[PDB]
Structure 1
């Protein structure tokens, strides 16, 4: 619904930057492309030259409903461009997806688990309370902007404001009132709610870059996919991340996708919000 809509707006140049990254290409591939599109793309990545449409039809076989829809989804997202009789895949996407399917991606590009002992008090229950309360607060905030005829971190308020889930208002003590977006946002399922905010967190950095040209969204998104491949209740090693990702842990903590302990900022714990992402 949301990620798809977001992606359908992205210009080619970004897609090819995003597909410098196996995990990304493989994540999209895995959990955007429908059962058939996968099948079509597999063969396509394997076969020698930009082959014949008719041969892809011979690949199709049964059921025979999505034969059209599958062409569109493929057409919009990847850099898998074609001209009648010829249907190519973009080097970047090919190269990226291959490495992924051959499990030959950088060793240090995944959630490196941590050797350090795990505080007995940090269980799935803790990591659920934490995350839950974190989201409670955000939801309470956007709620407390509904006319009545502390809350979250300042960085989130400003993000909701920028996102137009909330609008500045002269009348109200808060200085803030709910938008129709905000209403819609409040009705969405906890998954859709997290994506709604994350996509804003992304757009924000574009809206910034654009001006600041008087990390990029792609880096932020890649990392998100990574966090969706990690395991819940397991501690991961901070140092193994790239500077750009070490530099995103605060935002994701604010959002409740990550617990750090104060005791040891060598181990980051993804919450259920982080691992669910792509499975929803």
Structure 2
């Protein structure tokens, strides 16, 4: 993985991003709309059952009640939830409030935990975004086309803008997460190695990371306003606000609203005001970790006979610019016979990255054609040929460094090897010829240790 492991699982990315935030921002995060998200995104039952324990108990409990609640045949699963206890960063171990090592949760989060489960009040039904009492009365299939257009524009920036001329700043945004790579001889950015896998599963889990990308700056942006705004589209459809958000807003709320609309999770009316309605893709974000859909017959079907892998053709306007972005295949006279002489076109794209797991994922999981009709394994004997093409780019290495030669003793060269290894500037060592490669970044420090020993 090159930057997508934290996207498949949502409960792991939220705990990692929470550890590197400001203490004043985390205080405002502990609200009533955030209580239904730190538990629903989880999966194990042990990490979810401890939330109800800290709600009824008013006094801190020691660790003796925890080591006994596992009875005798359950402490093995207790160590798995130990690392997760520090991920949410909501508990606190005291000294001895009534026994030994008393565990207590932040009372700021405990107050808002009962509002969204048992107790209530009034401010919860007054603020917008989190509520917004408004029904839907607009053509639903007419708005589904705008949800696909928001994601199609992103595809143009990954290729090089073949026919788009919008002013959306989306090329630099995806470059921070390692998805888009800036072209060195030119100026339109291309795509990285991890960007190919995003155009395969087509899951709305990646759009959740794009919303928290602007918050990573930690300058003048708060999380309490983003968390209360992201809860709008999480309630599927029939969750609006008419014009209640217009009266209660500011300059910071309008900035995050324009960026979320361009992602493909919510649709906004003209003039960037009036009534807003979330898209259809936001339903799959709260359902599971992935999803499928978009076809009813699946006309595509590959070949499992030869080795050039005849890719599928004739589908829609999505697979036309998608295969050319992978490795730029070829086409003949009829209905665009793609991938017919794959021998040199694949090696052109592998020279800029080790894109080996994305081609196999696109060859095996493209529309589920062979695994439903046929029975044996989809790839024949190409699993070894693909690995051979990746090893061809390992025959050389373009890196700089300095070499030290002509020593005197053998036991003296072994001491110098530990100097470059601890600092992290050592690449390759040789005890038979007394040779060591040192990167130029730490060249001014290795020469000092040799003059003293």
TM-score (norm 1): 0.77
**Per-residue deviation at 1:53?**
2.5
Task: Give me the whole-angstrom Cα distance separating, in 2, the residues matched to 1:62 and 1:227.
Answer: 44
Say which of 194, 198, 203 aligns to 2:207.
194
Say which of 154, 159, 172 aligns to 1:138.
154
Structure 1 residues 45, 137: closer, same or farther in 2, change over 3 A? same
Assess if the C-alpha contact under 8 Å between 2:233 and 2:239 holds in 1.
Answer: no
Q: Write out the 4+ residue segments of structure 1 that deviate beyond 6 Å after TM superposition.
A: none
Mean alpha-carbon deviation: is it higher for 232-241 or for 247-256?
Answer: 232-241
**Per-residue deviation at 1:127?**
3.4
Task: Give me the whole-angstrom Cα distance separating, in 2, the residues matched to 1:61 and 1:169.
Answer: 60
Aligned to 1:25: 35
**Per-residue deviation at 1:250?**
1.3
Say which of 260, 265, 272 aligns to 1:257.
265
Assess if the C-alpha contact under 8 Å between 1:185 and 1:196 holds in 2.
Answer: no
Task: Give me the whole-angstrom Cα distance separating, in 1, the residues matched to 2:28 and 2:285.
Answer: 22
**Per-residue deviation at 1:60?**
4.5
Match status 1:113 vs 2:133: yes
Task: Give me the whole-angstrom Cα distance separating, in 1, the residues matched to 2:151 and 2:73.
Answer: 41
Aligned to 2:54: 44
Mean alpha-carbon deviation: is it higher for 88-97 or for 4-13?
Answer: 4-13
Task: Give me the whole-angstrom Cα distance separating, in 2, the residues matched to 1:103 and 1:134.
Answer: 40
Aligned to 2:319: none
- Structure 2: give runs of 5+ residues left out of the alignment: 1-5, 95-99, 290-453
Task: Give me the whole-angstrom Cα distance separating, in 2, the residues matched to 1:196 and 1:66.
Answer: 30
Match status 1:171 vs 2:202: no
Aligned to 2:227: 221
Per-residue CA distance 1:227-256 (angstroms, 9 max, x = gap): 313x31554324245434344221111112
**Per-residue deviation at 1:87?**
0.7
Task: Give me the whole-angstrom Cα distance separating, in 1, the residues matched to 2:73 and 2:253.
Answer: 42
- Structure 1: give runs of 5+ residues left out of the alignment: none
Which structure has the larger Rg over C-alpha atoms?
2
Assess if the C-alpha contact under 8 Å between 2:147 and 2:265 holds in 1.
Answer: yes
Q: Secondary structure at the match of 2:40?
A: helix
Match status 1:160 vs 2:174: yes
Assess if the C-alpha contact under 8 Å between 1:7 and 1:77 holds in 2.
Answer: yes
**Per-residue deviation at 1:62?**
9.7
* Bigger share in helix: 1
**Per-residue deviation at 1:152?**
5.9
Structure 1 residues 75, 161: closer, same or farther in 2, change over 3 A? closer
Q: Secondary structure at the match of 1:269?
A: strand
Aligned to 2:116: 100
Per-residue CA distance 1:245-275 (angstroms, 9 max, x = gap): 3442211111122112329933210113334
Aligned to 1:268: 276
What is the aligned residue count?
262
Task: Give me the whole-angstrom Cα distance separating, in 1, the residues matched to 2:272 and 2:194.
Answer: 39
Task: Give me the whole-angstrom Cα distance separating, in 1, the residues matched to 2:239 and 2:55.
Answer: 35
* Mapping of residues 59-98 of structure 1, within 5 Å: 59-60=69-70, 64=74, 66-83=77-94, 85-98=101-114
Q: Secondary structure at the match of 1:114?
A: coil
Mean alpha-carbon deviation: is it higher for 246-255 or for 8-17?
Answer: 8-17
Task: Give me the whole-angstrom Cα distance separating, in 2, the residues matched to 1:98 and 1:42.
Answer: 10
Structure 1 residues 86, 24: closer, same or farther in 2, change over 3 A? same
What is the alpha-carbon root mean square deviation over aligned residues? Answer: 3.2
